[PDB]
Write a protein that binds this ligand. Structure first.
Ligand SMILES: CNC(=O)[C@@H]1Cc2ccc(NS(=O)(=O)O)cc2CN1C(=O)OC(C)(C)C
Ligand SMILES: [Cl-]
Ligand SMILES: [Cl-]
Ligand SMILES: [Cl-]
Ligand SMILES: [Cl-]
Ligand SMILES: [Cl-]
Ligand SMILES: [Mg+2]
Length: 297
């Protein structure tokens, strides 16, 4: 049971050991496509690649490669696409993927500039009157509105397939204060944001998988998805005791390498799930408490 385990790991100070054991046990699958010479400029990091078996294939139209993985959680009945922060030359590919996969939401957990370096391209428009056209993939993207909170921003975007003139509303959930290789400020701040994404309907099984990214699409992205999937599993069962967080993380790691990048991010995942369980099991009031503690205004 997660809370008993948490306390025992905390008491023995064994988070590093528990985390390294996950790393040891994690799946290793080929990434042959990611490593083709022609794809070198489509990868942000030499050593972070999608497995072949679970990579997202683009539908256009000469090179189908994007550094993105489908995390398909069978038991939970939820899927996510985890991807790197797009590069200056892959922003068209990124939106092509959103279109083809029928995603309704994009969750961004990094900033464009972190520690002095560009860790993600400016892939969405910052001003209504300055829309973006991706000529390579024939898409247009327009900022419709934004709601700026203290540590996150929600944006409404309109994505248009210029080939057909069909338009779709995409919601962008941008967590601006989650440091790289770090953790959210509190369980409250994290859960307030996760529940904002949930409330939007973006995770509905009626849509394609939500797109989640950070810079590599593994550390912060893995933490977010682990917490969400664990909460969903216990919600379906109404049984917190049934969820084995480490088992869930190892399952997710069948689909993309490196998910959760530090022992403290693993620790934080437990805190987030234990706290979120209060809401799942019927303490409605905790949601307002998180909103207050997150100081979002
Ligand atoms: C310390 N790790 C790194 O600097 C790079 C790139 C990177 C950036 C930023 C990262 N954080 S995040 O944006 O939250 O994924 C993770 C990584 C991963 N990485 C690796 O070499 O990863 C493995 C899985 C070990 C191959
Ligand atoms: Cl940013
Ligand atoms: Cl900086
Ligand atoms: Cl970039
Ligand atoms: Cl950072
Ligand atoms: Cl790892
Ligand atoms: Mg303006």
């Amino acid at each position: 049971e997660m809370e008993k385990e948490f306390e025992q790991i905390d008491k023995s100070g064994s988070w590093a050991a528990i985390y390294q054991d996950i790393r040891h046990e994690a799946s290793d699958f080929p990434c042959r496509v990611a490593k083709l010479p022609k794809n070198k400029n489509r990868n942000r990091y030499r050593d972070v690649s999608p497995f072949d078996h679970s990579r997202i294939k683009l539908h256009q139209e000469d090179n189908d490669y994007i550094n993105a993985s489908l995390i398909k959680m069978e038991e939970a009945q939820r899927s996510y696409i985890l991807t790197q922060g797009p590069l200056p030359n892959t922003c068209g590919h990124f939106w092509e993927m959103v279109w083809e996969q029928k995603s309704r939401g994009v969750v961004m957990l990094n900033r464009v500039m972190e520690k002095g370096s560009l860790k993600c391209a400016q892939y969405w428009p910052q001003k209504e009157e300055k829309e973006m056209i991706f000529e390579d993939t024939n898409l247009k993207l327009t900022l419709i509105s934004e709601d700026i909170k203290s540590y996150y921003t929600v944006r409404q975007l309109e994505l248009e397939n210029l080939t057909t003139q069909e338009t779709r509303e995409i919601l962008h959930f941008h967590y601006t204060t989650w440091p790289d290789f770090g953790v959210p400020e509190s369980p409250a701040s994290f859960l307030n944001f996760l529940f904002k994404v949930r409330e939007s309907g973006s995770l509905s099984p009626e849509h394609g998988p939500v797109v989640v990214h950070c810079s590599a699409g593994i550390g912060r992205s893995g933490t977010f998805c682990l917490a969400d999937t664990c909460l969903l599993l216990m919600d379906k069962r109404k049984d917190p005791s049934s969820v084995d967080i480490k088992k869930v993380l190892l399952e997710m790691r069948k689909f993309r390498m490196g998910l959760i990048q530090t022992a403290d991010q693993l620790r934080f995942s437990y805190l987030a799930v234990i706290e979120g369980a209060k809401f799942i099991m019927g303490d409605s009031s905790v949601q307002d408490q998180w909103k207050e503690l997150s100081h979002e205004d």
